[PDB]
Design a protein around this ligand. Structure first.
Ligand SMILES: [Ca+2]
Length: 857
């Protein structure tokens, strides 16, 4: 768009890149009807077969049944699209608060607007992992590794430079602009946005559980339709009256009505509705649990996470350390808070290097900006003997090493008292192998075996206390103001060692224990010294007895054949790498064991992609979130355990709701079949069965899918990788539930047979519908009873039960008894027998549940 040929200053002049609202309304902002969705949601095969049944039931000129079935379709359609609109609003909220925020320099005004409210002509800084939202010209960048797999499918990391492209335009390998829709793999993206999202080049361009459940629905539909074909054949050939069959031409309509109503009852039309509704409410629960899930198909498998590979920093640690103990080569206890003066030479040297190498500062109280280790060190300095940060401003910062990932020598040089003071921090072992002088008062003499042994002794002593520890050095040549380079890095003295405790977040111990009780083996990666992380894991609670831990160096130097054997008994990885992250996530995925990675860094994205349910931290980079199936806003590990608990609750809601629906439908089916085998009038007419399918297979099933967490969700083994909807325990529950309720309907039909066939039909219908509405109570869980869990504890269930009771209260009205095949008027006993049978059914059902709690497991 005429920006390819311009250089940096030419883009500044031509596009007026440096009122901001004027440019926003002038250049433009850089950001499906619901009835159309309702029209397009008829793809459900259950909805298709029910709508063809509704249209044929309309074409025989019968009105009330047609309105009943049509009402079933519209209520499930409107509840599906209403919860779909709720999911759309939730997704818009997730895209709003977790929007990619680009740090904007603008006209020198350092702030950070979101992606939608950007405007061309303002400077934007892109750090590593800061996904660039809008295309724009770049002037300087240091090795800006930019991949373009989404903008144009360019998998290569193109390094944008100062060079422009005059008299040529091409979206391929070009360096002139950093286009939108691109991820900063590495580099510093100091560029100016030149494009509205409309003019950006990228702007110009169901779940596996859902698929398995639709396959199960199609199998059940074929079987059920075969069953109704058999039922229609029974009504046809079993009796057929005599040879003349009276008026069989005008009497096949009622038999086809019975078979069709059997199809409507048995078919779970609200299957996909239940799944979508509980996925929406589960996602809302994850949002309540500080867990913004990105990939929608990841909700079902979150209940199946038999392993989670987390990291201690961020999740198992709220940052802001407090160093509790320290080592000095002279040797004493803590003496910093009391000491007004410099006190011992080791203490004062350690304090000055801790302050000087500290990149961060306390600033205003409660405001921490830098690295957590440096924030902790300056908070320690300011905690003991009051203010100590004021000493840094009277100390120049000449030579500062940029703290390379292979260096661990964050340096500092001052000219205030010492001329060329080589002041650096780093890891314990790296300084121990690098620094070569001991600090005993003014003596600066090299290491020996016993001295190095004592340093290592205090190092492992701090390590087994779960204390990460840093080493410091002072010794330097006089020389003069150097070029801030390494110079002489083999002659450094050893100042004392300060070991900082890594405190876990609140309720980390409880969540860890409840995850270990749930069979969810937890795995924690770290980058510090090994036995420090081992003691941290012992503190957390994932280390006991036979468990082992291996470093990253041993991780990448060991073939997978023995690592597979060792994998099940190891939870701590130290000095890990993203390649080792790929290794561990693939090894955990190999033996089933659904994995949830944790990487928040930029190059952790391959580990997040290969992870089944890899979660990126909210404080982490945006490219990891793109590579992640889900995000934690509060970044805590307790959010992961709450997330997998919510996933288990959602899958248990699937199991319980499908159990309720299939059990009631099977009870009706076996009632009809038992009336069929014994040469009996069928228990329910067409309109009665359609009204039962109206009352249930609906809002009560939705409410049963809205059931909260039973007290044993974190006490069970994780679900298998496959869906396993027809689990053996839940199949036993389904068959017992359906057989019992059908037994109640059969007994009611037999009692009604003692009076009249019409009384039998009416009593069987009311027994079935009352037993469905009251079995909604007993099917709230497979562990807790309706009274045990509390009736009002599930507000949706009791509200829906009252709703269906009111709706069934149409039957008692005399104006609807004719269409419902309810004859005459009741004194007491046309209702009392049915109510007693239904109450006995649900109480039998409940003591069966208690027996499974008491006798069985
Ligand atoms: Ca149904």
């Amino acid at each position: 768009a005429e920006i390819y040929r311009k250089s940096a200053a030419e883009t500044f002049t031509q596009l007026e890149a440096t009122e901001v609202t004027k440019r926003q309304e002038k250049y433009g902002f850089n950001e499906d009807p619901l009835w159309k969705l309702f029209l397009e949601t008829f793809k459900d095969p259950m909805v298709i077969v029910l709508v063809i049944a509704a249209l044929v039931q309309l074409v025989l000129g019968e009105v009330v049944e047609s309105l009943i079935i049509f009402l079933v379709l519209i209520v499930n359609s409107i509840i599906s699209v209403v919860q779909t609109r709720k999911a759309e609003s939730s997704l818009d909220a997730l895209r709003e608060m977790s929007a990619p925020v680009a740090k904007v320099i603008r006209d020198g005004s350092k702030q950070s607007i979101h992606a939608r409210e950007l405007v061309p002509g303002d400077v934007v800084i892109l750090d590593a992992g800061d996904f660039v939202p809008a295309d724009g010209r770049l002037f300087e960048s240091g090795s800006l590794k930019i991949d373009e797999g989404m903008l144009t499918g360019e998998s290569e990391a193109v390094e944008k430079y100062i060079d422009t492209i005059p008299d040529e335009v091409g979206l391929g390998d070009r360096v002139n602009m950093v286009f939108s829709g691109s991820l900063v793999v590495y580099g510093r993206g100091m560029f100016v946005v030149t494009g509205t999202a409309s003019e950006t080049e990228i702007g110009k361009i169901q779940t596996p559980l859902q698929r398995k459940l639709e396959s199960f629905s199609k199998k059940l539909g074929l079987g059920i339709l075969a069953l109704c074909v058999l039922i229609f054949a029974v009504e046809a050939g079993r009796v057929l009256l005599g040879d003349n069959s009276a008026d069989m031409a005008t009497a096949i309509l009622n038999a086809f009505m019975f078979a069709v109503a059997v199809a409507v009852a048995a078919i779970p039309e609200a299957l996909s509705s239940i799944v979508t509704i509980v996925l929406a409410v589960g996602t809302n629960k994850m949002a309540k649990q500080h867990a913004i899930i990105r990939k929608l198909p990841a909700v079902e498998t979150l209940g199946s996470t038999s392993v989670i590979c987390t990291d201690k920093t961020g999740t198992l640690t709220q940052n802001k350390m407090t160093v509790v103990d320290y080592y000095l080569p002279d040797g004493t206890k803590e003496n910093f808070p009391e000491s007004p003066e410099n006190w011992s030479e080791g203490e004062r040297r350690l304090i000055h290097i801790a302050v000087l190498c500290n990149d961060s500062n306390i600033n205003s109280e409660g405001k921490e900006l830098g690295d957590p280790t440096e924030v902790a060190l300056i908070a320690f300095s300011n905690k003991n003997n009051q203010d100590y940060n004021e000493i840094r401003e009277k100390f120049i910062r000449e030579g500062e090493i940029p703290f390379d990932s292979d260096r661990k020598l964050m340096s500092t040089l001052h000219t205030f008292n010492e001329n060329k003071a080589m002041l650096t921090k780093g890891g314990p072992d790296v300084m121990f192998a690098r620094c070569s002088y001991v600090f005993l008062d003014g003596e600066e003499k090299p290491m020996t075996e016993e001295i190095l042994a004592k340093l290592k002794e205090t190092n492992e002593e701090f390590s087994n206390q779960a204390l990460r520890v840093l080493a410091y050095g002072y010794k330097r040549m006089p020389a003069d103001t150097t070029e801030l380079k390494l110079e002489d890095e083999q002659d450094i003295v050893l100042v004392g060692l300060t070991a900082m405790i890594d405190p876990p977040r609140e309720a980390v111990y409880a969540s860890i224990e409840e995850s270990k009780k749930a069979g969810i083996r937890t795995v924690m990666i770290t980058g510090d010294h090994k036995t420090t992380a081992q003691a941290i894991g012992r503190d957390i609670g994932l280390m006991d007895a036979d468990d082992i831990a291996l470093t990253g160096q041993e991780l990448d130097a060991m073939p997978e054949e023995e690592l597979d054997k060792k994998l099940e008994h190891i939870a701590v990885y130290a000095r890990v790498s993203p390649e080792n992250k790929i290794r561990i996530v693939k090894a955990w995925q190999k033996k089933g064991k659904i994995t949830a990675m944790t990487g928040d860094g930029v190059n952790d994205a391959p580990a997040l992609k290969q992870a089944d349910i890899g979660v990126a931290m909210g404080s982490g980079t945006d490219v990891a979130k793109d590579s992640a199936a889900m995000i934690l806003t509060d970044d805590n590990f307790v959010s992961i355990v709450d997330a997998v608990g919510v996933g288990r609750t959602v899958f248990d809601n699937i199991k319980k709701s499908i159990a309720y629906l299939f059990a009631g439908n099977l009870g009706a089916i076996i009632a009809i079949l038992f009336a069929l085998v014994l040469d009996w009038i069928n228990p329910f007419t067409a309109l009665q069965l359609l009204f039962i399918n109206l009352v249930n297979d609906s809002l009560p099933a939705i409410a049963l899918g809205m059931e909260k967490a039973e007290p044993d969700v974190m006490k069970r083994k994780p679900r298998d990788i496959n869906e396993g909807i027809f689990a053996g325990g839940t199949m036993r529950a389904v068959i017992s539930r359906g057989v019992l309720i059908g037994i109640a309907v059969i007994i009611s039909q037999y009692i009604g047979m003692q009076i009249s066939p019409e009384m039998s039909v009416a009593m069987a219908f009311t027994t079935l519908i009352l037993a469905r509405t009251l079995q909604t109570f007993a099917a709230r869980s497979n562990v807790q009873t309706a009274f045990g869990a509390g009736f009002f504890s599930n507000k949706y269930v009791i509200g829906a039960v009252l709703l269906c009771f009111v709706l069934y209260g149409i039957t008692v009205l005399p104006g609807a008894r004719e269409i419902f095949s309810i004859p005459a008027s009741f004194g007491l006993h046309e209702w009392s027998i049915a109510a007693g049978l239904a109450l006995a059914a649900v109480v039998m059902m409940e003591i069966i549940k208690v027996v499974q709690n008491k006798f069985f497991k």
